[PDB]
Design a protein around this nucleic acid. Structure first.
Lengths: 255, 49
DNA sequence: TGCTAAGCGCACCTAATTTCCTGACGGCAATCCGCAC
DNA sequence: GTGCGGA
RNA sequence: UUUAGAAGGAUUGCCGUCAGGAAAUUAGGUGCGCUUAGCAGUGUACCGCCGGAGGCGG
């Protein structure tokens, strides 16, 4: 019954997950969209009807936990492991698996659709964001939660957008060769993770987190992305990530 | 195990990593100039496990 | 509390050659493995 | 509470 | 309802000895800065006076 835009401005996230089996860097888009969905689910239990249908991701600064060597390469750092459940839980030294962590400052543009979208909604989002996480990281501080109307009320930064056309129109003989060639031609693009693909059928197995839902075994899928500034942008709708679900595919796309 | 919204409800998804894809990114990046990172956290005994 | 309005700021040509750039010794010890018997 | 088994 | 949920990297330390940068030079020709104006704005406020602080006379 009404539609608007809410901006979450300059949020500090400390120690967010940065490993997706072929990528070390920016976290996957599904974590940010799940943060938006978790905020939606927590606002609807306080009897405040709202629906978040699109999120835009803006970047201001980053820091990867580690250091840069003299040759210009990164060496990651991980915390010291503690007690882990299993057969060797009573030991003093535990195992070291594969992990990576990142630090971010970002801003979020949320498209909300509900019966009322005033500043009391902004106060409720301010009261409901001090009990949530982004990726697996904690929120130290935010600056201000406010409503926006046009492109000129947005702070300066660089947004992330999908560039699937630059991947389907390149090289050949397999998709990974297209990925490597497209990354060698234009140097301002990054590989990102954009959702999941099925590896089995839907059913019920033993050992689930919730034993009353449907279950599928999945694999992560990867695509290409790029950065555009906030003063060279056309429309709000061309930087908003949304959910899309086919049969066997769970994705995140910019229509 | 994570949740994913499918049409008014949710699906529970268990993610399994790919072993063959990890072997082919590393071979095809040893002879290339795009930025890359080497992870040196897994030992020999834990790899056999 | 006031302190100007207009225009413009070159055309040429060049920027050196030689010789060489060290010999030694060394660069840590500890720990980070599930599973079937 | 042991010892195996690879790169 | 986020590749979910958890984590102490620690202690110690002698970089040192020696030394020749060096020789030669041509920066040169030309040239219109320039038409107008009131230091004004008011150019600054003095003695008192009772009161005791607070208020009018010249």
């Amino acid at each position: 019954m009404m539609k608007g835009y809410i901006l979450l401005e300059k949020v500090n996230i400390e120690n967010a997950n940065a490993f997706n089996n072929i990528i070390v860097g920016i976290p996957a888009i599904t974590s940010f969209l799940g943060f938006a969905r978790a905020l939606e689910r927590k606002l609807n239990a306080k009897e405040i009807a709202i629906r978040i249908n699109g999120v835009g991701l803006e970047f201001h600064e980053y820091e990867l936990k580690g250091y840069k060597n003299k040759r210009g390469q990164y060496v990651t750092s991980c915390p010291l492991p503690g007690s882990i459940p299993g057969q060797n839980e009573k030991k003093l030294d535990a195992h070291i698996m594969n992990q990576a962590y990142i630090d971010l400052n970002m801003s979020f543009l949320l498209e909300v659709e509900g019966p009322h979208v005033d500043m009391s909604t902004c106060k409720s989002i301010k009261s409901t964001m001090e009990t949530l996480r982004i990726a697996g990281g904690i929120i130290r501080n935010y600056k201000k939660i406010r409503l926006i109307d046009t492109l000129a009320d947005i702070p300066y930064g660089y947004f992330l957008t999908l560039r699937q056309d630059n991947l389907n129109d390149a090289a050949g003989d397999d998709m990974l060769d297209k990925m490597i060639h497209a990354l060698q031609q234009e140097d301002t693009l990054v590989p990102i993770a954009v959702g999941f693909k099925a590896l089995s059928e839907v059913g019920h197995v033993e050992g689930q987190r919730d034993p009353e839902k449907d279950h599928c075994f999945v694999e992560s899928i990867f695509s290409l992305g790029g950065f555009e500034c906030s003063k060279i942008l056309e429309d709000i709708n061309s930087c908003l990530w949304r959910y899309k679900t086919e049969e066997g595919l769970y994705l995140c796309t910019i229509i | 195990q994570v949740f994913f919204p499918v049409g008014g409800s949710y699906h529970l998804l268990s993610i399994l990593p790919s072993t063959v894809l990890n072997y082919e990114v590393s071979d095809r990046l040893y002879r290339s100039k795009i930025p890359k990172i080497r992870l040196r956290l897994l030992s020999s005994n834990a790899a056999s496990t």
